[PDB]
Design a protein around this motif. Structure first.
Motif, PDB file in Angstrom:
ATOM      1  N   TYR A 226      -1.608  51.315  58.230  1.00  0.00           N
ATOM      2  CA  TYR A 226      -0.456  51.716  59.017  1.00  0.00           C
ATOM      3  C   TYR A 226      -0.585  51.197  60.444  1.00  0.00           C
ATOM      4  N   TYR A 227       0.555  51.107  61.120  1.00  0.00           N
ATOM      5  CA  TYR A 227       0.609  50.721  62.520  1.00  0.00           C
ATOM      6  C   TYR A 227       1.549  51.661  63.261  1.00  0.00           C
ATOM      7  N   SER A 229       4.550  52.613  65.288  1.00  0.00           N
ATOM      8  CA  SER A 229       5.856  51.975  65.381  1.00  0.00           C
ATOM      9  C   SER A 229       6.789  52.606  66.403  1.00  0.00           C
ATOM     10  N   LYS A 230       6.651  53.898  66.691  1.00  0.00           N
ATOM     11  CA  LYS A 230       7.494  54.556  67.680  1.00  0.00           C
ATOM     12  C   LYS A 230       6.659  55.496  68.533  1.00  0.00           C
ATOM     13  N   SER A 245       4.097  53.404  60.483  1.00  0.00           N
ATOM     14  CA  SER A 245       4.762  52.717  59.389  1.00  0.00           C
ATOM     15  C   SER A 245       3.771  51.822  58.660  1.00  0.00           C
ATOM     16  N   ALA A 247       2.555  48.369  57.283  1.00  0.00           N
ATOM     17  CA  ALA A 247       2.722  46.956  57.599  1.00  0.00           C
ATOM     18  C   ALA A 247       2.973  46.181  56.310  1.00  0.00           C
ATOM     19  N   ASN A 251       7.604  43.011  58.370  1.00  0.00           N
ATOM     20  CA  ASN A 251       7.029  42.948  59.715  1.00  0.00           C
ATOM     21  C   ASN A 251       5.648  42.309  59.604  1.00  0.00           C
ATOM     22  N   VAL A 254       2.654  42.520  62.756  1.00  0.00           N
ATOM     23  CA  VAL A 254       1.819  43.676  63.052  1.00  0.00           C
ATOM     24  C   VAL A 254       0.784  43.933  61.964  1.00  0.00           C
TER      25      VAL A 254
END
Lengths: 517, 106, 106
Positions: A226-227, A229-230, A245, A247, A251, A254
């Motif tokens: 996961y990365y 995102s917000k 979110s 990856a 996308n 990321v």
């Protein structure tokens, strides 16, 4: 004997499976240099200069043999064969011959020049097999064997530099006498030869990558990582949050990766459309450089970096690429159409662009107050997990260089391209033996100053065996190949014109076949 | 041993290179004088010659004179020193990477 | 593939024999110049050449009764002898001579 030849003309190439053997023979002329003297030289003797250009050294009466260029050994067609069919190559064996020596004496009367044979004169030749002399090969100098086998060439004069303080010398400076070496003496009838084995070196990469370092993933499957995102829920005050979110293929920027592009040292960008450049002088002031003992040197060509982005082939780094001259080009302030600028666009898949920042780094701590701040990286050194390609080699370019004898080095591949060796092919030094004119009939202790005017000519042969690394690609579609163009023209490329002048119309690299990462 | 040659002085001082360098970008004084001029790198301009090897790494240190009157009249032994951080602790970069102590004559 | 001007057509005929005087430069300058040498000593060469060819013959075994036609010289007097030199030393071939004088049936 005087009436018997000391060797034959050997010049061809043999392609034998995974080997290729090149043989070249040329005709050389050697004059007397320095009036048989050793002279101290410096920027003082050259007329002075700035601090960055000061030097101290010696010029010798000796000349030397250089064949450290690929066109000394490969014809254009042989180069095409090599680069269109192989992923790699490297040199293995060398054999060198010097034969059919002719020594001539020149007599100049009031109005006539007469050239005659001097059957009893000698030339001295030796190899610096123990690497005891300053190694001036590997500085991309003129004076190599000419590309065209019919051209007669003149042997360049040997000189070297040592430690300087301005135009002065320090006590650490070394003076070398080349007569203090054992050398073979040759009359017309004698020949010279030696053999050399190359060090084990890696194959040169005569391929381009068909994959990019940031595009090594499966474009159909998500990652299990996961990365972030917000960080804010939305507009307004006190909206802080943390959203994550997966990856995936939507996308790709990321995604987590295992390897990163190699190092960088940013260059200034110059356009061949001159109206796009700034209306000021920035050749020296805007250039990248390094400092050593208070002296500035151009970073040239520097680390292997991609010349430009996609679709920006009109841009080139200020001093980041090799620039060759066209046939008949002068030496001072020539226009851009007179030179040939190489571009390392094939390495853009692993190497950063020469005229761009490496990336961005954080430069503070964000908090609830300071916002997140980033800074540009203009020079990035080696990091673990970095991969890169080296600079390409060219038909007109150098082959090898001598790695300096130091405590430490990293990836000692020469920066102008080629094979770096601790024991490269040795320097070959040659000189006409001085022949005094008539001495006085009363003893004088001073060294003789009057000599017979002489020069020498002969044949030189070099044979190199190269090992090849063949391609076994599974690519379905056809590759890119170097080719000639069928369209009609006044002359044939890589041939002579109506006046007899041979020319090389373009630089040819080695990277046409493709390989995966 | 010490080296009797410098890394920026490894060339033959009598022979030109077969490589060119950009030497001029403007024809002269005035507006719209942009140009590109190239020259051969040779013994007269050794600073712009192409080279195969470059000097090793660096980590800059502050300069201190043994003639104390030449130093700044302030305390800078700790504040002006090069350092590295580990788990929130600062350590002096001492002696650090092998670098030449001073220039010629200094 | 018999050649149309006459003779024997071969895929591997007698090879071409190429010869050249090796160039001998005149005195070069005492400062290095990278351009190819343009000044040479004027030379030429002379010698002897020998060629020996073995030919296979195919003899006639004709049963013709009357005498054949043969190539012959003419007895009638003349200023010069055919296929010889004249008073000035010039050799000449006065006529073309073919090969077809004997006869054979179809």
């Amino acid at each position: 004997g005087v009436g018997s030849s000391s060797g034959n003309w050997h010049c061809d190439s043999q392609w034998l499976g995974d080997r290729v053997i090149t043989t070249s023979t040329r005709t050389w002329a050697l004059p007397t240099y320095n009036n048989h003297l050793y002279k101290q030289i410096s920027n003082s003797t050259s007329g002075g200069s700035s601090n960055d250009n000061a030097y101290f050294g010696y010029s010798t009466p000796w000349g030397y043999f250089d064949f450290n260029r690929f066109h000394c050994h490969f014809s254009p067609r042989d180069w095409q064969r090599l680069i269109n069919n192989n992923w790699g190559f490297r040199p293995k064996r060398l054999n060198f011959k010097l034969f059919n020596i002719q020594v001539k004496e020149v007599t100049d009367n009031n109005g006539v020049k007469t050239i005659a044979n001097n059957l009893t004169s000698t030339v001295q030749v030796f190899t610096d097999s123990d690497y005891q002399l300053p190694y001036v090969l590997g500085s991309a100098h003129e004076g190599c064997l000419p590309p065209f086998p019919a051209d007669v060439f003149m042997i360049p004069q040997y000189g070297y530099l040592t430690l300087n303080d301005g135009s002065q010398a320090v006590g650490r400076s070394s003076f070398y006498c080349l007569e203090y070496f054992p050398s073979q003496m040759l009359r017309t009838g004698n020949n010279f030869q030696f053999s050399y084995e190359f060090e084990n070196v890696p194959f040169h990469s005569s391929y381009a990558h068909s994959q990019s370092l940031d595009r090594l993933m499966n474009p159909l499957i998500d990652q299990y990582l996961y990365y972030l995102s917000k960080t804010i829920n939305g507009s307004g005050q006190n909206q802080q949050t943390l959203k994550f979110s997966v990856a995936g293929p939507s996308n790709m920027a990321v995604q987590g990766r295992n390897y990163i592009p190699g190092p960088s040292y940013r260059q200034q960008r110059v356009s061949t459309t001159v109206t796009q450049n700034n209306n000021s002088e920035f050749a020296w002031p805007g250039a990248s450089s390094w400092a050593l003992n208070g002296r500035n040197s151009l970073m040239n060509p520097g680390p292997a970096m991609a010349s430009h982005k996609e679709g920006e082939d009109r841009f080139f780094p200020l001093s980041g690429s090799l620039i060759f001259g066209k046939q008949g080009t002068g030496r001072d302030n020539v226009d851009a159409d007179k030179v040939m600028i190489t571009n390392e666009e094939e390495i853009k898949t692993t190497n950063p662009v020469a005229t761009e920042s490496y990336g961005q780094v954080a430069t503070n701590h964000q908090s609830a107050k300071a916002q997140a701040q980033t800074g540009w990286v203009q020079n990035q050194g080696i990091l673990p997990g970095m991969v890169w390609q080296d600079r390409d080699v060219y038909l007109q370019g150098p082959i090898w260089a001598k790695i300096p004898h130091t405590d430490g080095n990293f990836h000692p591949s020469p920066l102008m391209g080629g094979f770096g060796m601790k024991h490269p092919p040795p320097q070959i030094l040659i000189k006409n033996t001085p022949v005094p004119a008539d001495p006085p009939t009363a003893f004088n202790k001073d060294k003789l100053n009057s000599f017979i005017t002489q020069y020498s000519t002969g044949q030189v042969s070099v044979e190199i065996e190269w090992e090849l690394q063949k391609e076994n690609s599974k690519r379905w579609n056809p590759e890119i190949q170097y080719t000639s163009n069928y369209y009609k023209s006044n002359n044939v490329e890589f041939a002579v014109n109506t006046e007899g002048v041979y020319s090389e119309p373009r630089p040819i690299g080695t990277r046409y076949l493709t390989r995966n990462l």
